[PDB]
Amino acid sequence: NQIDLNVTCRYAGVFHVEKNGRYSISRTEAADLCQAFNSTLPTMDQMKLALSKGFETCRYGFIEGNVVIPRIHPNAICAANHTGVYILVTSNTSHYDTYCFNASAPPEEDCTSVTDLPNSFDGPVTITIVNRDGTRYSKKGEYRTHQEDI
Numbered sequence: 001n002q003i004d005l006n007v008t009c010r011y012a013g014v015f016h017v018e019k020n021g022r023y024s025i026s027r028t029e030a031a032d033l034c035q036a037f038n039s040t041l042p043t044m045d046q047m048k049l050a051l052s053k054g055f056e057t058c059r060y061g062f063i064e065g066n067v068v069i070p071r072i073h074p075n076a077i078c079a080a081n082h083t084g085v086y087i088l089v090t091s092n093t094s095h096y097d098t099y100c101f102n103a104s105a106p107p108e109e110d111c112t113s114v115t116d117l118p119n120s121f122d123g124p125v126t127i128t129i130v131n132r133d134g135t136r137y138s139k140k141g142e143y144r145t146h147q148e149d150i
């Protein structure tokens with residue numbers, strides 16, 4: 001009973017989280033996941049500021065209201081070569097990664113590891129934070145508050 005959470009650097013408090021390295025987070029689960037990081041789904045304005053500080057990914061994820069990919073450099077296989085906060089318009093499906101926003105993070109690029117899941121609750125799941133440099137932090141708990149997500 002195990003979940004990997006792959007996390008990025010924070011940029012103006014905004015970071016990306018993948019569950020088990022595959023698109024697998026619902027909108028409800030996304031909010032709960034950010035809450036476990038003492039974070040919220042970013043607003044568009046928060047994401048735009050993060051982008052301006054150097055944030056980009058090649059993965060769709062929830063923010064408040066939309067599913068997006070922040071892009072700095074044009075890449076043909078990431079958001080069809082777009083730059084800026086690319087907004088997903090048309091999709092059949094409901095499960096993505098998520099972005100999260102931590103107000104207490106540093107104001108610009110913070111490429112240190114994440115070493116805590118401070119607001120996880122009691123539960124049976126081994127949850128492992130996996131940093132891009134491979135650094136891991138594990139704890140037993142839960143973060144999902146909606147039954148349909150478990």
Ligand SMILES: CNC(=O)CCN1CCc2cccc(N)c2C1
Binds near residue numbers: 007018021058132
């Ligand atoms: C096109 N696919 C991607 O861009 C996936 C990027 N993933 C790849 C897997 C991974 C593992 C640990 C931490 C992080 N941030 C990541 C990021």
